[PDB]
From a paper:
This resulted in the rapid identification of ubiquitin variant (UbV) inhibitors that bound with high affinity and specificity to the viral deubiquitinating enzymes. Strikingly, coronaviral PLpros also act as vDUBs to suppress host antiviral innate immune responses by targeting cellular Ub-conjugated substrates.
Interestingly, substitutions in these UbVs were concentrated in the C-terminal region and only substitutions at position 68 and downstream were found to interact with the enzyme. The conformational freedom of a Gly substitution at position 74 enables the C-terminal tail of each UbV to form numerous favorable interactions with the enzyme. This alternative conformation permitted by Gly74 in CC.2 and CC.4 allows the side-chain of Trp76 or Trp77 of CC.2 or CC.4, respectively, to pack within different adjacent grooves near the CCHFV OTU active site, with Trp76 of CC.2 forming a cation-π interaction with Arg92*, and the amide nitrogen group of CC.4 residue Trp77 forming a hydrogen bond with the side chain of Gln149*. Differences between the orientations of the C-terminal tails of CC.2 and CC.4 arise from the variation at positions 75 and 76. In CC.4, residue Val75 packs against CCHFV OTU residue Trp99*, and Pro76 appears to restrict conformational freedom and enable hydrophobic interactions with Trp99* and Thr150*.
Residue numbers in the entry:
A (entry chain B): -2 to 77
B (entry chain A): -2 to 162
């Protein structure tokens, strides 16, 4: 439908697939990573082309189209 | 060696400016001595003090926290991970400097710059098996300040074992 596929390489070295919409907010994409991988949104650092993405933007604000590769790291040191 | 070969073959990916990730697979204690640190909430700074300060005691971490202050005043506003804190510079410092408040990869990034060192955090499962390393700075494992991270909030210090120096 209106959904595309993107890839996220996680801090653990796992290249996962994610189903998203270009209009999803970074916040929505974090929530999907929570569901698939259990990382709390508050902890996630989503990266695309060397930039850490911000919660009020959309994938499309970053020219993030189908089959894009993002990086997900997260904080270490704080509770979950 | 094969140990040295292994440590020399770590594959680091720069995910954002000056921050690198790798996913070697290994028992942390096969290559490092663990220097255990208290579980008082200050362990991040204890671990750093153990590796950077002579005659380290249970109160040396306060010095690391003060270096974190001066680091923050230069670097907090532009640190990507600071965005996740969501506090002004001054409110961050007040929280960061309070007693027994967890340190993290955010302070590691800033201390790397402030102390002119490379910091690696190896994050392990409860089996002490490595799930990833995150490196702040451009140095290698043999000269870096190596920290062991476990159980969400706990850090210990690491020293490479003599046979691999
Ligand atoms: Na060896």
């Amino acid at each position: 439908d209106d959904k595309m596929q993107i890839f996220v390489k996680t801090l653990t070295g796992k290249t996962i697939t994610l189903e998203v919409e270009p209009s999803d907010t970074i916040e929505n994409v974090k929530a999907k990573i929570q569901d698939k991988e259990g990382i709390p949104p508050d902890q996630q650092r989503l990266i695309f082309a060397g930039k850490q993405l911000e919660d009020g933007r959309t994938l499309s604000d970053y020219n993030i189209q189908k089959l894009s590769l993002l990086y997900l790291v997260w904080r270490l040191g704080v509770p979950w | 060696g094969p140990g040295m070969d292994f440590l020399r073959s770590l594959d680091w990916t720069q995910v954002i400016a000056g921050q690198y990730v790798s996913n070697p697979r290994f028992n942390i204690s096969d290559y490092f001595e663990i220097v255990r640190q208290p579980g008082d909430g200050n362990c991040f700074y204890h671990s750093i003090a153990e590796l950077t300060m002579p005659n380290k005691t249970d109160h040396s971490y306060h010095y690391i926290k003060r270096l974190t202050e001066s680091a923050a005043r230069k670097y907090y506003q532009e640190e990507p991970e600071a965005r996740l804190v969501g506090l002004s510079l001054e409110d961050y410092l007040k929280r960061m400097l309070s007693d027994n408040e967890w340190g993290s990869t955010l302070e590691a990034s800033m201390l790397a710059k402030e102390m002119g060192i490379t910091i690696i955090i190896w994050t392990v499962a409860a089996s002490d098996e490595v799930e990833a390393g995150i490196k702040f700075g451009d140095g290698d494992v043999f000269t870096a300040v190596n920290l062991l991270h476990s159980g969400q909030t706990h850090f210990d210090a690491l020293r490479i074992l003599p046979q691999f120096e």
